Amino acid sequence: MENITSGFLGPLLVLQAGFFLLTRILTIPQSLDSWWTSLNFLGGTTVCLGQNSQSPISNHSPTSCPPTCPGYRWMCLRRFIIFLFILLLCLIFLLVLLDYQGMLPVCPLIPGSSTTSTGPCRTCTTPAQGTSMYPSCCCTKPSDGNCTCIPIPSSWAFGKFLWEWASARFSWLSLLVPFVQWFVGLSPTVWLSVIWMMWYWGPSLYSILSPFLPLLPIFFCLWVYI
Amino acid sequence: MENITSGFLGPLLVLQAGFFLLTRILTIPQSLDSWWTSLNFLGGTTVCLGQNSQSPISNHSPTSCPPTCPGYRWMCLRRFIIFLFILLLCLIFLLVLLDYQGMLPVCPLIPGSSTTSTGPCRTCTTPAQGTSMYPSCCCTKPSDGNCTCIPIPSSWAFGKFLWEWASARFSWLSLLVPFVQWFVGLSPTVWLSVIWMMWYWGPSLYSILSPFLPLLPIFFCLWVYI
Amino acid sequence: MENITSGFLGPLLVLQAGFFLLTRILTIPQSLDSWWTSLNFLGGTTVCLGQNSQSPISNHSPTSCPPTCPGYRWMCLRRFIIFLFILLLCLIFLLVLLDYQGMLPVCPLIPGSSTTSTGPCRTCTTPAQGTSMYPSCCCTKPSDGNCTCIPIPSSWAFGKFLWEWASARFSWLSLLVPFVQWFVGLSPTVWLSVIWMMWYWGPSLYSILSPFLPLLPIFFCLWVYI
């Protein structure tokens, strides 16, 4: 085709490109309205008949009530708002996915004597307050100091980049994270079966044993003199 | 008593406040429940089906519906889902805020020739492979030994550089240029006042020109020919 | 064998085989009818729509109701079509039930350099035409006289030449091949949990997939350009 088609080509491409974008947009809004209803439904109906009638219209009105109607106008506004919300939420998944490409560095810092290769310290001595996240380490110090510092290496997706620095701030909270770790060490597969059986639990177990949970203060008093 | 009474009473008050922290956290759940009720019922009231027949209570369980009786499991499930959504959006805000701040790492590696150092270059980089992309700057070039690249910026982590790149990396340059010119040509706040006046016009204009835009969608064979 | 009945043992075996074959043939009709009735009768009853008030049938139903059943001719046609389909299915099953005893051949011919022979090569293959593909190994190369290629292995029933050759056609499929490999390597001992999750929760799975259907072309085009 190419040029020969291009020579005889007219405005067909114009309409072809122009359309189906409105579909790709509006369908996402109507679908989002459907899921919002479902969450509201959770075993409920469609309603959308509370916008009075304003006309002899069939007040069934799934998702948006009807459009071209006074009630559905602000429903259309809510649809536009939700469309903006989704157009925002897409970037969250986009960044979450793209972060594991490894192109991005974490560019972290930690105190140690390790080196990826042959690194001569030459009496590397210049310390500072807050050794973590120190100066740029472009040999930025009282002198050059013969400095070699960290490149962007490989980690469990930027855990060393951000989590490790934050986990240092956890420290004692990270010490309780070891408690949640021996809790996590409890087998997961078996835990999968337990959770599967635990559908009868949850809100139902909450209803079953809520009153005792408020009575936890007696145990707190007991453990006070533990 | 003294500071030993101090410790016992304080463990007691710790139980007490965890109680208050739990109430504060759980408040956000019902808060978001009312949020969804308001948003979905834009100009609408609140009537659950959770106040079903198997509910001796009145319509008091038909607005936001914790609804311990009848439909309870799915209401609590929606509550947990919204809680997860909020605990997600909190990161969406906090990460951007911390990235802008100062401390967050943003070590960049892109092709450039900007120079700011002391007695630099005269060896520089001579990489004729891997295009112009740069790898972790321990010593990016295959044979670089005295290499020194660029330190992270005080301004928000990349962002502007990524936008400038995607202005050509995601192309759209020609289209963006006219659109950017038009946006600059409408930058004046007087038009912003006009746009605000158009709020009432907005839905009204959409209602008036629904068929109007339908007809314009032909444009007499799209501007005669093209 | 050791027959001790002469003309009596053989007739008994023939009668047993005929009865078994007739039972299987009827079951395939009968069991298939029951199966797809249940497919419809996950809910809906079995009252014969094709049956009519020809002779006031007390209950013209029983899935496929035959005899006359007004429109038993259509019922008979459906039964015959189902029987043909079941015959095809069992023939395919029997065909798959092969190559496990080593009877099946899997003589492969693909480009490679693996060597396992006695005093081999030093002449080998010098074909500079037809790319790297190999033809029937009488003597594949245009001028090969002492040629010896590769014997069929003990590797699973699959010829696997179609596999790798089509893995070349769809390298992305070959990429996910390791993914599914460790997914199977994740141990089928926990596959029961996956099965349970697939049940029931598949409804919300399709509910979410509804967004994926709107988002499938968008992401596909995104990575199409990416």
PDB file of N, CA, C and O in Angstrom, chain B residues 54-110:
ATOM      1  N   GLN B  54     -35.072  -9.057  57.512  1.00  0.00           N
ATOM      2  CA  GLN B  54     -34.498  -9.667  58.710  1.00  0.00           C
ATOM      3  C   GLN B  54     -33.692  -8.631  59.498  1.00  0.00           C
ATOM      4  O   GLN B  54     -32.493  -8.770  59.738  1.00  0.00           O
ATOM      5  N   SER B  55     -34.388  -7.573  59.901  1.00  0.00           N
ATOM      6  CA  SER B  55     -33.779  -6.474  60.649  1.00  0.00           C
ATOM      7  C   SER B  55     -34.875  -5.794  61.454  1.00  0.00           C
ATOM      8  O   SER B  55     -35.612  -4.947  60.927  1.00  0.00           O
ATOM      9  N   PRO B  56     -35.020  -6.141  62.734  1.00  0.00           N
ATOM     10  CA  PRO B  56     -36.046  -5.478  63.555  1.00  0.00           C
ATOM     11  C   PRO B  56     -35.819  -3.987  63.713  1.00  0.00           C
ATOM     12  O   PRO B  56     -36.769  -3.261  64.029  1.00  0.00           O
ATOM     13  N   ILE B  57     -34.591  -3.509  63.505  1.00  0.00           N
ATOM     14  CA  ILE B  57     -34.327  -2.082  63.613  1.00  0.00           C
ATOM     15  C   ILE B  57     -35.005  -1.333  62.471  1.00  0.00           C
ATOM     16  O   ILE B  57     -35.373  -1.900  61.435  1.00  0.00           O
ATOM     17  N   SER B  58     -35.169  -0.031  62.671  1.00  0.00           N
ATOM     18  CA  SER B  58     -35.815   0.837  61.696  1.00  0.00           C
ATOM     19  C   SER B  58     -34.820   1.210  60.600  1.00  0.00           C
ATOM     20  O   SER B  58     -33.814   0.530  60.374  1.00  0.00           O
ATOM     21  N   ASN B  59     -35.102   2.306  59.894  1.00  0.00           N
ATOM     22  CA  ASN B  59     -34.233   2.796  58.832  1.00  0.00           C
ATOM     23  C   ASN B  59     -32.927   3.351  59.388  1.00  0.00           C
ATOM     24  O   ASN B  59     -32.104   3.885  58.637  1.00  0.00           O
ATOM     25  N   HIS B  60     -32.725   3.223  60.701  1.00  0.00           N
ATOM     26  CA  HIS B  60     -31.479   3.646  61.327  1.00  0.00           C
ATOM     27  C   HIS B  60     -30.278   2.861  60.819  1.00  0.00           C
ATOM     28  O   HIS B  60     -29.141   3.291  61.036  1.00  0.00           O
ATOM     29  N   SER B  61     -30.502   1.736  60.150  1.00  0.00           N
ATOM     30  CA  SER B  61     -29.429   1.015  59.484  1.00  0.00           C
ATOM     31  C   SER B  61     -29.692   1.087  57.988  1.00  0.00           C
ATOM     32  O   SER B  61     -29.774   0.053  57.313  1.00  0.00           O
ATOM     33  N   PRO B  62     -29.832   2.295  57.440  1.00  0.00           N
ATOM     34  CA  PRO B  62     -30.038   2.433  55.994  1.00  0.00           C
ATOM     35  C   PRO B  62     -29.467   3.739  55.468  1.00  0.00           C
ATOM     36  O   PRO B  62     -30.012   4.319  54.528  1.00  0.00           O
ATOM     37  N   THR B  63     -28.388   4.229  56.078  1.00  0.00           N
ATOM     38  CA  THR B  63     -27.719   5.418  55.560  1.00  0.00           C
ATOM     39  C   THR B  63     -26.268   5.131  55.191  1.00  0.00           C
ATOM     40  O   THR B  63     -25.854   5.341  54.047  1.00  0.00           O
ATOM     41  N   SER B  64     -25.496   4.644  56.157  1.00  0.00           N
ATOM     42  CA  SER B  64     -24.128   4.195  55.941  1.00  0.00           C
ATOM     43  C   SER B  64     -23.917   2.761  56.377  1.00  0.00           C
ATOM     44  O   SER B  64     -22.995   2.106  55.888  1.00  0.00           O
ATOM     45  N   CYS B  65     -24.747   2.268  57.287  1.00  0.00           N
ATOM     46  CA  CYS B  65     -24.954   0.851  57.530  1.00  0.00           C
ATOM     47  C   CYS B  65     -23.714   0.098  57.985  1.00  0.00           C
ATOM     48  O   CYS B  65     -23.170  -0.716  57.229  1.00  0.00           O
ATOM     49  N   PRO B  66     -23.236   0.341  59.200  1.00  0.00           N
ATOM     50  CA  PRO B  66     -22.437  -0.672  59.876  1.00  0.00           C
ATOM     51  C   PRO B  66     -23.239  -1.955  59.979  1.00  0.00           C
ATOM     52  O   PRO B  66     -22.695  -3.054  59.797  1.00  0.00           O
ATOM     53  N   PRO B  67     -24.556  -1.837  60.261  1.00  0.00           N
ATOM     54  CA  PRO B  67     -25.486  -2.965  60.090  1.00  0.00           C
ATOM     55  C   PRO B  67     -24.989  -4.285  60.651  1.00  0.00           C
ATOM     56  O   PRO B  67     -24.768  -5.230  59.890  1.00  0.00           O
ATOM     57  N   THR B  68     -24.806  -4.360  61.972  1.00  0.00           N
ATOM     58  CA  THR B  68     -24.305  -5.589  62.580  1.00  0.00           C
ATOM     59  C   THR B  68     -25.207  -6.774  62.257  1.00  0.00           C
ATOM     60  O   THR B  68     -24.733  -7.908  62.124  1.00  0.00           O
ATOM     61  N   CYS B  69     -26.507  -6.532  62.124  1.00  0.00           N
ATOM     62  CA  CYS B  69     -27.447  -7.580  61.753  1.00  0.00           C
ATOM     63  C   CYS B  69     -27.640  -7.597  60.241  1.00  0.00           C
ATOM     64  O   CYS B  69     -27.085  -6.742  59.538  1.00  0.00           O
ATOM     65  N   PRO B  70     -28.429  -8.555  59.713  1.00  0.00           N
ATOM     66  CA  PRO B  70     -28.657  -8.642  58.260  1.00  0.00           C
ATOM     67  C   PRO B  70     -27.378  -8.569  57.443  1.00  0.00           C
ATOM     68  O   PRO B  70     -26.400  -9.257  57.744  1.00  0.00           O
ATOM     69  N   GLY B  71     -27.377  -7.732  56.408  1.00  0.00           N
ATOM     70  CA  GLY B  71     -26.190  -7.562  55.597  1.00  0.00           C
ATOM     71  C   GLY B  71     -25.092  -6.852  56.355  1.00  0.00           C
ATOM     72  O   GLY B  71     -25.151  -5.636  56.561  1.00  0.00           O
ATOM     73  N   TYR B  72     -24.082  -7.606  56.786  1.00  0.00           N
ATOM     74  CA  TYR B  72     -22.988  -7.034  57.558  1.00  0.00           C
ATOM     75  C   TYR B  72     -21.639  -7.369  56.939  1.00  0.00           C
ATOM     76  O   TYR B  72     -20.725  -6.537  56.935  1.00  0.00           O
ATOM     77  N   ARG B  73     -21.513  -8.587  56.409  1.00  0.00           N
ATOM     78  CA  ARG B  73     -20.218  -9.058  55.932  1.00  0.00           C
ATOM     79  C   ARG B  73     -19.718  -8.208  54.776  1.00  0.00           C
ATOM     80  O   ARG B  73     -18.560  -7.780  54.758  1.00  0.00           O
ATOM     81  N   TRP B  74     -20.586  -7.938  53.804  1.00  0.00           N
ATOM     82  CA  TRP B  74     -20.161  -7.190  52.631  1.00  0.00           C
ATOM     83  C   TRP B  74     -19.993  -5.708  52.929  1.00  0.00           C
ATOM     84  O   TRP B  74     -19.143  -5.054  52.317  1.00  0.00           O
ATOM     85  N   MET B  75     -20.771  -5.164  53.865  1.00  0.00           N
ATOM     86  CA  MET B  75     -20.536  -3.790  54.296  1.00  0.00           C
ATOM     87  C   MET B  75     -19.149  -3.649  54.905  1.00  0.00           C
ATOM     88  O   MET B  75     -18.387  -2.740  54.552  1.00  0.00           O
ATOM     89  N   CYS B  76     -18.793  -4.563  55.809  1.00  0.00           N
ATOM     90  CA  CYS B  76     -17.461  -4.538  56.399  1.00  0.00           C
ATOM     91  C   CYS B  76     -16.388  -4.797  55.356  1.00  0.00           C
ATOM     92  O   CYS B  76     -15.285  -4.248  55.449  1.00  0.00           O
ATOM     93  N   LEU B  77     -16.685  -5.630  54.361  1.00  0.00           N
ATOM     94  CA  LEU B  77     -15.724  -5.877  53.293  1.00  0.00           C
ATOM     95  C   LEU B  77     -15.463  -4.610  52.493  1.00  0.00           C
ATOM     96  O   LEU B  77     -14.312  -4.282  52.185  1.00  0.00           O
ATOM     97  N   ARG B  78     -16.527  -3.886  52.143  1.00  0.00           N
ATOM     98  CA  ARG B  78     -16.362  -2.615  51.451  1.00  0.00           C
ATOM     99  C   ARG B  78     -15.591  -1.633  52.316  1.00  0.00           C
ATOM    100  O   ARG B  78     -14.767  -0.860  51.813  1.00  0.00           O
ATOM    101  N   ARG B  79     -15.847  -1.655  53.623  1.00  0.00           N
ATOM    102  CA  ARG B  79     -15.104  -0.799  54.539  1.00  0.00           C
ATOM    103  C   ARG B  79     -13.616  -1.123  54.503  1.00  0.00           C
ATOM    104  O   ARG B  79     -12.773  -0.223  54.423  1.00  0.00           O
ATOM    105  N   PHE B  80     -13.278  -2.411  54.556  1.00  0.00           N
ATOM    106  CA  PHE B  80     -11.877  -2.812  54.512  1.00  0.00           C
ATOM    107  C   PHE B  80     -11.242  -2.427  53.184  1.00  0.00           C
ATOM    108  O   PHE B  80     -10.078  -2.009  53.138  1.00  0.00           O
ATOM    109  N   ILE B  81     -11.992  -2.567  52.092  1.00  0.00           N
ATOM    110  CA  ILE B  81     -11.473  -2.212  50.775  1.00  0.00           C
ATOM    111  C   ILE B  81     -11.171  -0.721  50.708  1.00  0.00           C
ATOM    112  O   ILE B  81     -10.121  -0.303  50.206  1.00  0.00           O
ATOM    113  N   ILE B  82     -12.091   0.102  51.208  1.00  0.00           N
ATOM    114  CA  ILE B  82     -11.864   1.543  51.211  1.00  0.00           C
ATOM    115  C   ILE B  82     -10.691   1.892  52.117  1.00  0.00           C
ATOM    116  O   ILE B  82      -9.912   2.807  51.825  1.00  0.00           O
ATOM    117  N   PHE B  83     -10.553   1.175  53.235  1.00  0.00           N
ATOM    118  CA  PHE B  83      -9.418   1.400  54.124  1.00  0.00           C
ATOM    119  C   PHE B  83      -8.107   1.105  53.415  1.00  0.00           C
ATOM    120  O   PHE B  83      -7.130   1.849  53.559  1.00  0.00           O
ATOM    121  N   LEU B  84      -8.068   0.018  52.649  1.00  0.00           N
ATOM    122  CA  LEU B  84      -6.883  -0.287  51.858  1.00  0.00           C
ATOM    123  C   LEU B  84      -6.626   0.796  50.818  1.00  0.00           C
ATOM    124  O   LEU B  84      -5.479   1.194  50.595  1.00  0.00           O
ATOM    125  N   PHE B  85      -7.686   1.287  50.174  1.00  0.00           N
ATOM    126  CA  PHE B  85      -7.520   2.343  49.179  1.00  0.00           C
ATOM    127  C   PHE B  85      -6.926   3.598  49.806  1.00  0.00           C
ATOM    128  O   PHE B  85      -6.069   4.262  49.208  1.00  0.00           O
ATOM    129  N   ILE B  86      -7.373   3.938  51.013  1.00  0.00           N
ATOM    130  CA  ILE B  86      -6.848   5.114  51.702  1.00  0.00           C
ATOM    131  C   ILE B  86      -5.400   4.884  52.117  1.00  0.00           C
ATOM    132  O   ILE B  86      -4.545   5.770  51.983  1.00  0.00           O
ATOM    133  N   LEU B  87      -5.106   3.694  52.650  1.00  0.00           N
ATOM    134  CA  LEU B  87      -3.736   3.371  53.032  1.00  0.00           C
ATOM    135  C   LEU B  87      -2.830   3.296  51.813  1.00  0.00           C
ATOM    136  O   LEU B  87      -1.602   3.285  51.948  1.00  0.00           O
ATOM    137  N   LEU B  88      -3.418   3.207  50.622  1.00  0.00           N
ATOM    138  CA  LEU B  88      -2.630   3.311  49.401  1.00  0.00           C
ATOM    139  C   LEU B  88      -2.397   4.769  49.022  1.00  0.00           C
ATOM    140  O   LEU B  88      -1.258   5.177  48.769  1.00  0.00           O
ATOM    141  N   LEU B  89      -3.467   5.566  48.985  1.00  0.00           N
ATOM    142  CA  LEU B  89      -3.343   6.972  48.609  1.00  0.00           C
ATOM    143  C   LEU B  89      -2.440   7.748  49.559  1.00  0.00           C
ATOM    144  O   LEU B  89      -1.835   8.752  49.151  1.00  0.00           O
ATOM    145  N   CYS B  90      -2.333   7.307  50.816  1.00  0.00           N
ATOM    146  CA  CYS B  90      -1.426   7.977  51.742  1.00  0.00           C
ATOM    147  C   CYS B  90       0.007   7.900  51.239  1.00  0.00           C
ATOM    148  O   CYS B  90       0.749   8.887  51.296  1.00  0.00           O
ATOM    149  N   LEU B  91       0.413   6.731  50.740  1.00  0.00           N
ATOM    150  CA  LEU B  91       1.723   6.612  50.116  1.00  0.00           C
ATOM    151  C   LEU B  91       1.818   7.486  48.873  1.00  0.00           C
ATOM    152  O   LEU B  91       2.849   8.124  48.635  1.00  0.00           O
ATOM    153  N   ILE B  92       0.747   7.537  48.075  1.00  0.00           N
ATOM    154  CA  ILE B  92       0.757   8.333  46.850  1.00  0.00           C
ATOM    155  C   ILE B  92       1.052   9.793  47.154  1.00  0.00           C
ATOM    156  O   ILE B  92       1.702  10.486  46.361  1.00  0.00           O
ATOM    157  N   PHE B  93       0.578  10.286  48.295  1.00  0.00           N
ATOM    158  CA  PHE B  93       0.890  11.658  48.687  1.00  0.00           C
ATOM    159  C   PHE B  93       2.282  11.763  49.309  1.00  0.00           C
ATOM    160  O   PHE B  93       3.088  12.628  48.927  1.00  0.00           O
ATOM    161  N   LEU B  94       2.577  10.883  50.272  1.00  0.00           N
ATOM    162  CA  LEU B  94       3.790  11.013  51.074  1.00  0.00           C
ATOM    163  C   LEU B  94       5.047  10.828  50.237  1.00  0.00           C
ATOM    164  O   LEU B  94       6.051  11.513  50.458  1.00  0.00           O
ATOM    165  N   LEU B  95       5.024   9.889  49.288  1.00  0.00           N
ATOM    166  CA  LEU B  95       6.200   9.652  48.460  1.00  0.00           C
ATOM    167  C   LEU B  95       6.542  10.875  47.623  1.00  0.00           C
ATOM    168  O   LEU B  95       7.710  11.276  47.551  1.00  0.00           O
ATOM    169  N   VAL B  96       5.539  11.491  46.993  1.00  0.00           N
ATOM    170  CA  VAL B  96       5.787  12.692  46.201  1.00  0.00           C
ATOM    171  C   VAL B  96       6.298  13.817  47.091  1.00  0.00           C
ATOM    172  O   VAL B  96       7.252  14.530  46.740  1.00  0.00           O
ATOM    173  N   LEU B  97       5.680  13.985  48.265  1.00  0.00           N
ATOM    174  CA  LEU B  97       6.109  15.048  49.169  1.00  0.00           C
ATOM    175  C   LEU B  97       7.561  14.861  49.597  1.00  0.00           C
ATOM    176  O   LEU B  97       8.347  15.815  49.579  1.00  0.00           O
ATOM    177  N   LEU B  98       7.937  13.637  49.971  1.00  0.00           N
ATOM    178  CA  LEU B  98       9.310  13.379  50.395  1.00  0.00           C
ATOM    179  C   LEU B  98      10.281  13.527  49.231  1.00  0.00           C
ATOM    180  O   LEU B  98      11.413  13.993  49.413  1.00  0.00           O
ATOM    181  N   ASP B  99       9.858  13.129  48.028  1.00  0.00           N
ATOM    182  CA  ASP B  99      10.721  13.252  46.860  1.00  0.00           C
ATOM    183  C   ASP B  99      11.030  14.710  46.556  1.00  0.00           C
ATOM    184  O   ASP B  99      12.159  15.049  46.181  1.00  0.00           O
ATOM    185  N   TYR B 100      10.039  15.587  46.708  1.00  0.00           N
ATOM    186  CA  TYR B 100      10.283  17.000  46.451  1.00  0.00           C
ATOM    187  C   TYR B 100      11.245  17.596  47.474  1.00  0.00           C
ATOM    188  O   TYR B 100      11.982  18.540  47.164  1.00  0.00           O
ATOM    189  N   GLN B 101      11.280  17.039  48.688  1.00  0.00           N
ATOM    190  CA  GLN B 101      11.691  17.813  49.855  1.00  0.00           C
ATOM    191  C   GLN B 101      13.108  18.374  49.787  1.00  0.00           C
ATOM    192  O   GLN B 101      13.288  19.567  49.520  1.00  0.00           O
ATOM    193  N   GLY B 102      14.067  17.447  49.848  1.00  0.00           N
ATOM    194  CA  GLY B 102      15.492  17.706  49.791  1.00  0.00           C
ATOM    195  C   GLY B 102      16.236  16.379  49.867  1.00  0.00           C
ATOM    196  O   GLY B 102      16.994  16.024  48.964  1.00  0.00           O
ATOM    197  N   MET B 103      16.012  15.649  50.958  1.00  0.00           N
ATOM    198  CA  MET B 103      16.778  14.444  51.300  1.00  0.00           C
ATOM    199  C   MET B 103      16.671  13.228  50.364  1.00  0.00           C
ATOM    200  O   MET B 103      17.673  12.566  50.094  1.00  0.00           O
ATOM    201  N   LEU B 104      15.465  12.933  49.878  1.00  0.00           N
ATOM    202  CA  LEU B 104      15.216  11.774  49.002  1.00  0.00           C
ATOM    203  C   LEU B 104      16.220  11.594  47.858  1.00  0.00           C
ATOM    204  O   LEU B 104      16.613  12.577  47.218  1.00  0.00           O
ATOM    205  N   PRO B 105      16.611  10.329  47.572  1.00  0.00           N
ATOM    206  CA  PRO B 105      17.593  10.248  46.487  1.00  0.00           C
ATOM    207  C   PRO B 105      16.974  10.331  45.093  1.00  0.00           C
ATOM    208  O   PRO B 105      15.876   9.825  44.859  1.00  0.00           O
ATOM    209  N   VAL B 106      17.695  10.974  44.181  1.00  0.00           N
ATOM    210  CA  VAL B 106      17.265  11.131  42.800  1.00  0.00           C
ATOM    211  C   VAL B 106      18.456  11.082  41.851  1.00  0.00           C
ATOM    212  O   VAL B 106      18.450  11.776  40.829  1.00  0.00           O
ATOM    213  N   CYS B 107      19.494  10.293  42.189  1.00  0.00           N
ATOM    214  CA  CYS B 107      20.697  10.167  41.367  1.00  0.00           C
ATOM    215  C   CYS B 107      20.357   9.926  39.899  1.00  0.00           C
ATOM    216  O   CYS B 107      19.855   8.851  39.543  1.00  0.00           O
ATOM    217  N   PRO B 108      20.619  10.894  39.027  1.00  0.00           N
ATOM    218  CA  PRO B 108      20.249  10.760  37.617  1.00  0.00           C
ATOM    219  C   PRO B 108      21.432  10.396  36.730  1.00  0.00           C
ATOM    220  O   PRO B 108      22.591  10.691  37.028  1.00  0.00           O
ATOM    221  N   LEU B 109      21.104   9.761  35.603  1.00  0.00           N
ATOM    222  CA  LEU B 109      22.101   9.355  34.608  1.00  0.00           C
ATOM    223  C   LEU B 109      21.464   9.478  33.226  1.00  0.00           C
ATOM    224  O   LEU B 109      20.725   8.587  32.796  1.00  0.00           O
ATOM    225  N   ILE B 110      21.740  10.586  32.546  1.00  0.00           N
ATOM    226  CA  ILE B 110      21.219  10.842  31.205  1.00  0.00           C
ATOM    227  C   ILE B 110      22.326  11.461  30.361  1.00  0.00           C
ATOM    228  O   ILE B 110      23.295  12.007  30.913  1.00  0.00           O
TER     229      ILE B 110
END
